[PDB]
Amino acid sequence: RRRVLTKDGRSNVRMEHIADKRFLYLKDLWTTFIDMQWRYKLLLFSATFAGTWFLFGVVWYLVAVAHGDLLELGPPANHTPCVVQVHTLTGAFLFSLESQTTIGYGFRYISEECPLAIVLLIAQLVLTTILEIFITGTFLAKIARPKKRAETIRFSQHAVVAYHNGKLCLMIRVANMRKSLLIGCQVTGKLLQTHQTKEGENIRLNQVNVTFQVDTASDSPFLILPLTFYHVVDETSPLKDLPLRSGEGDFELVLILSGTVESTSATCQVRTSYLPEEILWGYEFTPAISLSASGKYVADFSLFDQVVKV
Amino acid sequence: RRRVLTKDGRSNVRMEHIADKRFLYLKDLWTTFIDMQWRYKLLLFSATFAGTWFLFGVVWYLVAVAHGDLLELGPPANHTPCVVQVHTLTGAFLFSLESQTTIGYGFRYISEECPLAIVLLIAQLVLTTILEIFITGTFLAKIARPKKRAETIRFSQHAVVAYHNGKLCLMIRVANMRKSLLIGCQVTGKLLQTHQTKEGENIRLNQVNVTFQVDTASDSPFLILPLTFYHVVDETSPLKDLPLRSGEGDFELVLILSGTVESTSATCQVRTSYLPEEILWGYEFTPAISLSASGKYVADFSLFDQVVKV
Amino acid sequence: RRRVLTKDGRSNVRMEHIADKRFLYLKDLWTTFIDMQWRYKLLLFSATFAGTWFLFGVVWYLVAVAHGDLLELGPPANHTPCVVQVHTLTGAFLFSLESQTTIGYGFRYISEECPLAIVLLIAQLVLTTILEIFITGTFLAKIARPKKRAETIRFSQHAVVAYHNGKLCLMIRVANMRKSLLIGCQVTGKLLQTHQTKEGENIRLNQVNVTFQVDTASDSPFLILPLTFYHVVDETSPLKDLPLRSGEGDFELVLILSGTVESTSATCQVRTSYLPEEILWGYEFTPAISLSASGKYVADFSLFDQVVKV
Amino acid sequence: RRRVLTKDGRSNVRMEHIADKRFLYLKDLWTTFIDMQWRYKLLLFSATFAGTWFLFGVVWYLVAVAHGDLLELGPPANHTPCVVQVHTLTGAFLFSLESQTTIGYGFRYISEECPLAIVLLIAQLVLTTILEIFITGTFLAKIARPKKRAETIRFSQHAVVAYHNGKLCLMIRVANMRKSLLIGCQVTGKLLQTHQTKEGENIRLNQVNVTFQVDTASDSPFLILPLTFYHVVDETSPLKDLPLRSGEGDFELVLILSGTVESTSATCQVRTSYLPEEILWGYEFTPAISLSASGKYVADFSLFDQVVKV
């Protein structure tokens, strides 16, 4: 069906008819390259390097021409070229490359004759350094993004409603698949209904906070183990008036876990959604924790999504 | 007219008569270079590189002189130079460059004769490495700045007053022009009046928080779509006593959206201002959302700033 | 005995029976390499470098072969090789190395004859640059991790119960072993009981927040000196009903200090645990602060863990 | 006199008699090098580079020896050295350098004869790369530290007590000397009294939060202009019972401004202290703001510290 967020936590919206998109993106190149697709990004990386090499090699060839350094034109035995062993396009490209990369073999080098060549070399080095820097930065930042970390954090496929501590409550379970920890883990539940004006020329979405609690409805400093979050269906519950029967209703329950990563001090936001159908009644999650002669606690993730009727 | 903040969210204040500005800036070079203008920054980049090359080349020339390595002075056939193929200023500059860049062609190299030359080379490499590092850092940081990201986030040109849920309220709309998300999005409204002491030798600015709400006056975890923020004009509203008629009054309504970026974990603060004139009465924003056979929701930003009378 | 967290603040849990672990880890390589062990990490570093060198050297050797550049096969006096002075495996490896590192001696270099060689070189440089970048990033990030900073922050070995300001309270002491500061230091106490279903096929852990206070139960902006945190045993204390006698009970008191580092703006979370036995009754911590002719305050950490009966 | 914090916001405490300091510092090298003094840091930088060069050059010399490559020992005309043009200590050092820096002149290079030399070179490159990386990181991080940014933020030299809005309150003023902004600026006031046990073998410091407010006692999103913070001396004021007369009392009023930097998303904490003497009675700060034909507001910082009697 239609859903604002994918079960995977991804957006589902398409923005359109934006004016002045191109210029704006060109203003903030950093964010642009970061958000860009991987394929075009690698293309641009390789293109930067090789195309700079190629262009400046063409320029070196032209310079060799103007100075009459080519062999075809028969330079005198006392002709000093602007650049040594550069009498062909290939050689100019190789010089450009060997320079921009700081390899510096030595078979092709500069003479003290043509200053313009020196100035050109300088410009080449400076600009290429700048571009290389910028690209390397974008690449590191695009890898470091924490979105990809959200996958090793998993929400239960199904949320379940049942009596906890005598109170009818809605419950979910969350887990971390890695040894690396989260920090300041907090959960928030949003409710999104469908407000259709008599025919759907437009839609206004109503947000309603849904508080989920663990210990005191406060926070959970660390996500050590698969935890169960629960929200109370009381007189204040915006859910109270919903069709409590399974499958009935037109609403989305979005869930958001925000927490700081320990190894990078970066924030991470996992997201997901539950539909009126996906939610289940009178079911309690199977416990997925148990002791061991280890003296250590163990988490069996096959019991994570498992549930049992009440 | 006069405004503390530009519609674009930029400051409008000029600090003056600061003592010990220069020395202070010299203490914190990092922040200085980061906040500096782009042109002077590129100038300094190029200058660092080329000028270090040039100075150390001059030094190499002087060394060649003191050792009598120049051709003009007729070194014996058994004269060993401190540096090879360095008998001119140009050659010394080229040596400096080829070294500092780690190119290393080979036509110009060092001999095992003059140690001072070796020590000098060492110093050159170390210092130039340090400077290059510092500049590269400043450059990366100056690009990564999130200010430039604020442009792809847009506030409605006009705020409007009208009855929402039966309550007279002030309303604005906000949107994100990119697919990249924000996080922990919160809004705050400040009111700034004009307190003139009988003649304007001085002015004292009174701040007054204005709370804007969406769902529960709490927060908005993610900025998926163009959202509408609204503040209630009740007995506690500092606006209550203002001249509610359009155009009347001497006050600024500053708006601030604070939120964390998803791809960089950095904070971003968008800002703007509304004047007593810019605010409009009895108008409601045109809905800019609508379904599609996509199964996806769509945002038509041409309807963003659009409004309709009530 | 069994404990969720080690006295050292480390986890004690083993997650098992995870499905699709390998592919997931391969998706997020950044986090993986960061969390990986040091030995395998250095192995991978060295392997990247040397193995890329080795493979591309093998390729260069094969190319030399196909072009008949080897000496063993007797190239004519007018035979131009794709690469110079490359007639052996060793030489090909050396060429690969000298290139990928941008050393560029010069005895072994490229000719303008074989383009395929040029294209191959290009590919080599690009890929190796990318890999080097990625590894360097992971290495920097794995060092910068703040976990290792938690060691220079120390919790008292023993917590003690006694009358403070006439109120029975539980008290602990915390200190920083360095001159570098913390920021936004806040403390939280969790209580973890043992809920065994009649036999231990499963266990459900109940979290209970325990608030610790210093001045107003608010926060402590800076961790200048060894501070004492204390929690009140009142009617609301979840501890109130515990066996207050030393050694009795089956519960863990976990302690968590969260604070921001000043020099890196990164977060840090120190953790520890106290068992019913480790806790002591009617004891007050020895003061570890005292003046000095310095005019400066001094902290004697030998008095840190020291206690005195009341 | 004695003060916990310097007027400049620096600590004044000396920690002593720490056990296992050295090993701990060696565990967390990152933080150590970051917090280290500049002089020793530059020493270590230069030492890393030059000393690695020197040691590996010594090794190359020894290798040349074992292989009998030295001239002094008269190698046959058909003797192939492990390394070319390396017959002296100086030459070995130069080879080490030219390699570790990726310069690669070419007059001194490797032969395909001695593999051990190749393996040694590999080790050298790898280790030196690692060390260079680590040092560069520490250096960048030590510069980027925001402490140094606190200097361009200034607190009023004197705090003053007087009637504001009819209420006796304590007031201070704060300013930013740069165009770069702060974010989430919040202020906290701590009160520190002197608890001497009958003779000063020990001292227990009592913290008491003092709330300072601007608009609603909430926060100040941005530090645009010199702002005045004030705290109310009411029945709840811990100051209420102090000797309100100037100069009387034994207490320190510490002030802490916490805020996020806009250009780096980093936190910054400015600190200062006021003594019972420094505080002044019945004085109000001179306004340091005034209009201009600019249409812009201006801040005259010479009026910052200025005050006027009431």
Curated annotation (Swiss-Prot), chains A, B, C, D:
Keywords: ATP-binding, Cell membrane, Disulfide bond, Ion channel, Ion transport, Membrane, Nucleotide-binding, Potassium, Potassium transport, Transmembrane, Transmembrane helix, Transport, Voltage-gated channel. One of its GO terms (cellular component) is monoatomic ion channel complex. It is found in: Membrane; Basolateral cell membrane. Channel activity is strongly regulated by variations of cytosolic pH; channels are activated by alkaline and inhibited by acidic pH values. Activated by phosphatidylinositol 4,5 biphosphate (PtdIns(4,5)P2). Inhibited by Ba(2+) and Cs(+). Changing residue 51 to R: Loss of potassium ion transport. Predominantly expressed in the brain, including in glial cells of the cerebellum and forebrain. Expressed at lower levels in the kidney, and other peripheral tissues. Changing residue 41 to M: Increased activation rate by PtdIns(4,5)P2. It is a multi-pass membrane protein. The lineage of its organism: Eukaryota, Metazoa, Chordata, Craniata, Vertebrata. One of its GO terms (molecular function) is inward rectifier potassium channel activity. May be responsible for potassium buffering action of glial cells in the brain. Inward rectifier potassium channels are characterized by a greater tendency to allow potassium to flow into the cell rather than out of it. Their voltage dependence is regulated by the concentration of extracellular potassium; as external potassium is raised, the voltage range of the channel opening shifts to more positive voltages. The inward rectification is mainly due to the blockage of outward current by internal magnesium. Can be blocked by extracellular barium and cesium. Residues 141-310 are cytoplasmic. Its main location: membrane. ATP binds at residues 184-191. Residues 63-88, 106-114 are extracellular. One of its GO terms (biological process) is response to glucocorticoid. The keyword Transport applies. A motif (Selectivity filter) lies at residues 102-107. The record marks 132 as: Role in the control of polyamine-mediated channel gating and in the blocking by intracellular magnesium. Belongs to the inward rectifier-type potassium channel (TC 1.A.2.1) family. KCNJ10 subfamily. Changing residue 141 to V: Decreased potassium ion transport. This is ATP-sensitive inward rectifier potassium channel 10. It catalyses: K(+)(in) = K(+)(out). Homotetramer. In kidney cells, it forms heteromeric channels with Kir5.1/KCNJ16; this interaction is required for KCNJ16 localization to the basolateral membrane. Interacts with MAGI1, alone and possibly as a heteromer with KCNJ16; this interaction may facilitate KCNJ10/KCNJ16 potassium channel expression at the basolateral membrane in kidney cells. Interacts with PATJ. It comes from Rattus norvegicus. The chain crosses the membrane at residues 36-62, 115-140. 1,2-dioctanoyl-sn-glycero-3-phospho-(1D-myo-inositol-4,5-bisphosphate) binds at residues 10, 142, 145, 147.
